[PDB]
Structure 1
């Protein structure tokens, strides 16, 4: 059972801007996704401060980076608060309509794409490097769901029958053919140290056989 949705016109416009604009500093996608994971971890920590049972779905608060050269995927896993089905449909929990509006005025007033995270729509920078993005997520108040889009104006949502997560979000980046540098260990390490050296959660870079 797969439901297909249309992006709001402004989000579709943001995505094709990210896809079609010439912009060489593509590595900022990883900074934005790690920063999104840090925000989600902050939220479940804050809720656990007054209600410890919110961590019954998992006590560890961390971020894992898993490259896979065979599948040509880079996966960012976090054990944050996760997303409900309604959040996934509502632009993955963001205020993307007003965020895109403020982002695109800032661009024509002298900003560049790397500032996308300041407008709340940093997730869509994933399409700087990925032809297709899959988001697996589990929130305490909902079941596990899978969001997917290759851009082109539409996305899908389905109940995920895959590996149970417990709680959190998994962003799977199916990388473009000319962007496999972001699967190499030393390149990921360089980006993490450059842009995310102060994130307050352990970032584990997985290695391959």
Structure 2
């Protein structure tokens, strides 16, 4: 009938132990920006692949870029991509699932229910590290997104509760996603223009597309500087 085991499904809490060790993230909090950039690049690859067969895929927004803006006075970091974007359903379900993956009840049992066992595995294997590291540097994450198949919506969470609303400004993105982080007090430095510039350059290996930072050059003029 089958290949017999035992003890040892209980010894499956090496998984619990491994999840703890991925607390390499506390030691390397700046990885949140690497992940934001990498996920931005993925969302752009995804819409690009779609445009190969769908001539209307890029209609919402012609360009394929990542735009990062610090706002020191308001304590915000924004990372904006013109990639595939996310429907309301994806904001609710898949962020819901991703935020879940850093807990006790989610891991030790499910048990393969009711989503899509392998799809959940892939969702977390890709985005888990990014979501978790963002909440090591931010008290709130706001996700504004526009997918070709839906209207623009805004998801916000403090990691404990979330809400989603239709964006009352309508479609300002054209298509794509803005991730806005309200930074923790200790994460002050990510509001600095130099710091952000140097991190973007350090992680440009993880983008297949132009990445700009809103930056000043001397009145002093502000514009998008191309980082790669």
Name the TM-score class by shorter chain: 0.7 to 0.9
**Contact residue 39 and residue 127 of structure 2 kept, 8 A:** no
Look up the match of 2:127: 120
Is it true that 1:59 corresponds to 2:24 in the alignment? no
The within-5 A match list for 1:13-28 is 23-28=26-31
- The structural deviation recorded for 1:24 is 3.5
Q: Secondary structure at the match of 1:29?
A: helix
**Which runs of 5 or more residues in structure 1 are unaligned?**
1-16, 106-116
User: In the aligned structure 2, how far is the partner of 1:156 from the partner of 1:56?
Assistant: 29
Superposition RMSD in Å: 2.9
Alpha-carbon spacing, 1:51–1:22, altered in 2? closer, same or farther (3 Å): closer
Structure scoring higher RCO (CA < 8 A, sep ≥ 6) equals 1
User: In the aligned structure 2, how far is the partner of 1:130 from the partner of 1:23?
Assistant: 13
Q: Which has the larger radius of gyration?
A: 2
**Contact residue 83 and residue 93 of structure 1 kept, 8 A:** no
**Contact residue 83 and residue 139 of structure 1 kept, 8 A:** yes
Look up the match of 1:154: 161
Aligned to 2:194, which of 186, 195, 201?
A: 186
- The structural deviation recorded for 1:180 is 1.1
Is it true that 1:177 corresponds to 2:185 in the alignment? yes
The total of aligned residue pairs comes to: 178
User: In the aligned structure 1, how far is the partner of 2:91 from the partner of 2:127?
Assistant: 15
The runs of at least 4 aligned residues of structure 1 exceeding 4 Å deviation read 93-101
**Which runs of 5 or more residues in structure 2 are unaligned?**
1-19, 109-123, 217-221, 223-228
Aligned to 2:39, which of 36, 46, 71?
A: 36
TM-score by length of 2: 0.69
Q: Secondary structure at the match of 2:215?
A: coil
